[PDB]
């Protein structure tokens, strides 16, 4: 399965209105076209994705993309895959002012909610409706931020100490002491969310009134327990849902950064450049052997140059079904930066997922052998040979 | 008056400035301490020429210059050397480390906190002027300071002053020899500065001057001192029309008018003909025809480019010495008779000439021989694109793998800022390959 | 001003330090009592890099001495230069690490690290504009590895902008002095690969081979090895202290040498070495310096550069010489040996020239190479590590001090990742 | 600064202590009465080394030692001998009968009423020390006191102190010759406390030292004094790194870290290479390579066991005198090429090196030649198990018929605290067999698959 890719355009901001600008991006169906303000009517480019989203014009319903539309398009399928048993992940991307946060968080106070609370709503409704005497669910949450190559917990109370990152030899990288908390209702997780979003570190720039200074990841552990005490086993399925709100690419001459802000921007840019290299290299690695010869050339991908890539190594490649949501600025001023985002979005589409559903090996083998033996015994008994 | 302000940035600029100011002081009769005994022995004249020296009440002559660098180890040699009493004490070191061959450090993080002092000193220097004509900026590509800080300074100068001419004397990277691994990034990132804010950029190459020293001057093991002396001679030959009398004088605006057909092609080459040792100064007439033919030799160019592969768009010749216009008009004809030198179709004239009476001086301990006729040529041609193209290839080989990029990103620069610059450079190349296409 | 703080840890680092301050004192001109009795005027111009001033015109070295055994402190004090260092900087304890990495890193060093950091803060606060740190230690022991990596982590946490260097004496292939070298080496490299900007790989076997085959000594001792290491140490930093034609701060070397963050392991070299009796036959000039400098038997890391590819190399010359000759020689050594240089870096030699040579020499040169062959060394340790971790050979000494097997496993995994990273560029082809 | 208490129990321990303290006094220039005129002649120095001696106001030095026994006959020789004024009067003798080659009497019928006083004196000695390294217990298997009282004392010390190191130097029964009939019972009953509580135990044999004295020093009729002198030289070479300056120093804990792989196999053998008479001290170079080679010769071992029948798990070399690390590296390299010496595959390095500058001293009236270089080697190997097996056979031949058992049970011992010890010993004999086996071929199943 390929890494799914969604693209969305936001409307103009006051910064793009005080300094006059024009709309450069168009789209039809799943295809998006980029025009060149600097050399117009020379080489308009086009790129094909899984989803394109025109949220420029709210008053008109002509191919308008609401939050519920994007959610029903990708988050519903991700939650369905999670209910099947997969571990799933959809992470944002874009430049400072692309609306990556407006897409993954949205505004709780309005009906235009992001793709994090609507999943939570759908998950809680599904488990509440599907709960029975022989069906139960256990849901736990965690939320961590990466400020400058240090992991901080938002759910925990004030704990100044930074958290250490370890590598379980079988399970891969993880964080130690990440405050994982169980939830039983919508209101509980919502209060946890309010605390987490309030704890996140933000700062004001010339490009955005309230910008983010840290990457942020929301992890939900979902446990399906089928309780037929006579026949079945409990804790049947375990799944991981993770949504990522990356920090925006900083430009310096067009943000006004200075002092501490400049250092934060430099760290953010280093992390994003490492992520981009990982994306391109991974896409090359999965594209080549699949069609070249199948030789499995041992060019290995390197996630150790940043804690972001290290933590998200499973989601980038391996046992996870993953998708991207690139936010774009329509103004001509950002034409270069926007174009880069589009290119990276294209590099995300070629990446392949290697995801499986697995359980305890003894249970799986015993059940399969029992099914095979039952079929063979039924065939033998039906013919009088047993 | 006719006055210029010199700005030297980085180690290369500072050392070239040392050589240049040694030459000017020897030319005008100013002692290293600033006093001029010629005034008290003569009692007249204008040997305190205002083009480079400002006179105080006591009789001292302070030069119009601003030295800049981001480390103390180079400029301190000036502060404790032979010329310590000539310059003003304000020499504008940053009391920190250097840019470490990094454009981002020299343009965004460390390049600031000294730009304001430099601008204040330049403003003070220009306030004393009464007819300032232009600026002379000396720097070197491939260095963090000479690229980044020069870019910042050029932006600020263009904003502040605007109309004054801004010439450039720069050291382009060589095709083969090099002294840093990340030269192409620093050289490509500064195309915007030399292309947008500069008015006429002259370039030289270390390999070409090494070959000239090896062949013409018979120096087997040259060092940077000889290179600096040669560049100083060329700058003096350019500027001499402002200071001394002559039969035909050429101002800086005339150079810009005749060497720059369109705004974006202000990248001429420079050559200096009678480079010859004292032993070989005999056995040769060194007449006008010999020296003016020497300029067109491919082997005597100061950048490793072959003029035969392109077309000559403009040419400016500056003679210093016992030259009479008759001999000049006759050579311009012979070189127009020769077929190996190609001129574009839309420039039927081609040549500008200027003559000055003051012959070149000799630096004690130098390697050039005393001579009575010299000529400096500045030629706008299409061959320079060759020297660009090679560099672009090198850039690609390092940018495909994002080598040495995290150093630049960690200091405040964005990744896309690389690629954008490259496109600009390509566009520049494209325009020097469509001003020659014969007209139809 | 560009001021360096020096730290020494363990017996090996302490003794190497001693001989470094006997090579940096003579070059500037400092008496053992701390007074100045030099001749040239350029010796005091940049003395503040490595020396603080004291009221009687005296100069104290800006250093810090660390151990967990008083014996090495007593040996240094009872010596020719024991009285030059500040008494308050002699930080030490008792009941040393016992060749155990856990004791140095977790149990014993965790008490002394606070005092050492207090001294470091006091020393760094007095500086005008701090350049970076440098630390000398051996990876085969307990005190060195443990407290060195702990101090590196703490200092990098507190001073993130500054450049950090290390000079590591690392386990030899055949020569062995202790039995639990692989565990300590692996656990120390796991931290070194993360919390440093440059690392220089020293190996005892290479130094012994140089002393035998090049210097023709009959009975080498540790003093000669310290002599060579000190010469390289001074040559690396010569450009901060004396003027020249081309200059190279430590940061410039770091920028030009490190293409990607996890590749900062270097092979050092020095020239000329002549053996005290063959100098009358050997001429001295730039080509012969380059010839000895690029030779495989000169390198101090016991790794053959011909088994891989030079990522990037750097040469710092000291003396009065022409630039054309230097550039021509570097171009020639590039072109003749093009098989051993990576193809996607068009020019991978950094050059620097300083005017003042050492006292008794007319010319000298130092070499910092970065090549893939270093991976070989790590493989050796890795193999040995497996041979003792498959059966828990000496594990209970470590786990008894508050450690677990997961740390060993992830430490091995990180080194294997580093080896795979270095290998990726080693093989030919690759190209565009 | 780095103190070590020495505890001597039994006749063998007391006599080895006499030899050891004679050597130490000769080494540090302390007269038998405790005074040190060399310091007065020098005018000041650190010769009053705190590793073994404690200084008082008047300049007298008292050793850090604790002698214990139940027979007054042995301690009374010291109390009226040459060193009567050196030791503190507290010599801790039990003015009663002796254990009489009976483990039970030494342990918990006569070992009581004297253990408390011994522990009090050891507490005072340890309180005087400003930083301890460990203990050095000298005893002998076979004897009643040296088994039972040693077991009780180690039990109490392990309870009280716990973390501090505890070393042994013990006389194991010889394969053929013996001076008692009920030795195997005592040795087997001692092995449990030797195993659980001690941290590193060295063993020596009288027969091997007799053979060494005969072949090397050309003494046809040796006595216990020569053997005690050799053991004293071994212990001095062990502890030399704490006292004198050296290029590479090895602390007592470094031995444990580098020499014992697992907690239950801490039974190494010891050897001393340049044992040679004064007459034969000439005609020979005695270089570093020669002594290093001699350390591995099976004939020079101090326990009657062949290293060729097992495998070397680890080794530790301590050099003393004019040695330069280069020759040591060359010696180790040539040893690593021989095929007779075998090393377990899971210890590729298998060597520890330590160099000290002080050369060994010569005791007046001794039989060892004055030399300029010496080496002491400690090898942790699997051959030693063979020796144990021999002794084990003897035990069975006496326990089938319950011979000499009523003496043991008559002093408050259950019959089944015998067989129990045997089983423990058997378990130990299993482990030394298990560790020495090479790793099974491709221990992690089989490899080789897609990449
Ligand atoms: C007659 C003559 O030419 O004397 C030379 C000499 O013969 C040679 C052999 C010297 C000599 O070096 C050695 O023999 C040596 C032995 C072991 C380890 C290192 C060196 C010399 O000792 C070393 C000494 O070096 C210096 O004087 C430098 O200043 C040197 N100084 C020290 O290292 C030093 C050591 C202790 C106390 C004070 C200073 C230095 C080198 C690099 C950076 C800083 C300082 C020199 C030129 C020589 C002798 C005296 C024979 C050489 O040493 C170096 C590294 O320069 C060996 O390689 C050079 C080549 C020289 O020709
Ligand atoms: N012609 C000539 N070129 C020089 C001279 N000195 C340095 N260069 C050139 O300068 C380049 C190196 O960059 P530099 O200008 O020295 O760097 P910088 O100005 O000191 O700035 P930093 O790197 O931050 O120190 C080399 O490629 C040299 O060719 C000189 O004296 N004469
Ligand atoms: N090497 C050596 N061994 C000795 C020496 N003295 C006694 N032994 C050994 O010790 C054994 C006897 O045990 P001891 O501990 O001396 O007996 P004890 O100390 O008198 O205690 P009891 O058994 O109660 O009498 C003998 O078999 C000897 O082999 C000695 O001086 N040197
Ligand atoms: N499509 C949209 N519709 C309505 N409001 C939007 C939209 N996009 C952005 N905004 C508002 O404008 C601001 C910019 O969006 P935001 O999501 O903060 O950018 P970002 O991609 O997160 N980059 P950063 O500011 O660095 O976090 C937000 O505060 C939103 O409230
Ligand atoms: N070059 C050099 N190496 C040494 C010296 N002394 C010891 N070593 C090396 O250091 C290693 C032992 O490390 P050690 O000093 O005990 O580390 P520590 O115990 O933590 O202080 C051995 O492998 C030796 O090769 C010396 O004087 N010079
Ligand atoms: Mg955001
Ligand atoms: Mg510089
Ligand atoms: Mg007795």
Numbering used by the authors:
A (entry chain K): 4 to 389
B (entry chain A): 1 to 440
C (entry chain B): 1 to 432
D (entry chain E): 1 to 451
Quote the paper.
To advance structure-based drug development, we determined high-resolution structures of KIF1A harboring the KAND-associated P305L mutation in complex with MTs, using the same nucleotide conditions as those for MT-bound WT KIF1A. The KIF1A-P305L mutant, like its WT counterpart, exhibits classes with both one- and two-heads-bound configurations in the presence of AMP-PNP: the leading head in an open conformation and the trailing head in a closed conformation with nucleotide bound to both heads (MT-KIF1AP305L-ANP-TL1). Weak densities corresponding to α- and/or β-tubulin tails connecting to the motor domain were detected in all nucleotide states, suggesting that the P305L mutation does not prevent interactions between the K-loop and the α and β-tubulin tails. A notable divergence in the P305L mutant is the reorientation of F303 due to clash with the introduced leucine residue. On the other hand, the five best AF2 models of WT KIF1A more closely resemble the MT-bound structures in this area. These predictions, along with the conformational changes observed in the MT-bound structures, indicate that the P305L mutation induces loop-12 conformations that are suboptimal for MT binding, thereby shifting the equilibrium towards the MT-unbound (or weakly-bound) states, as observed here.
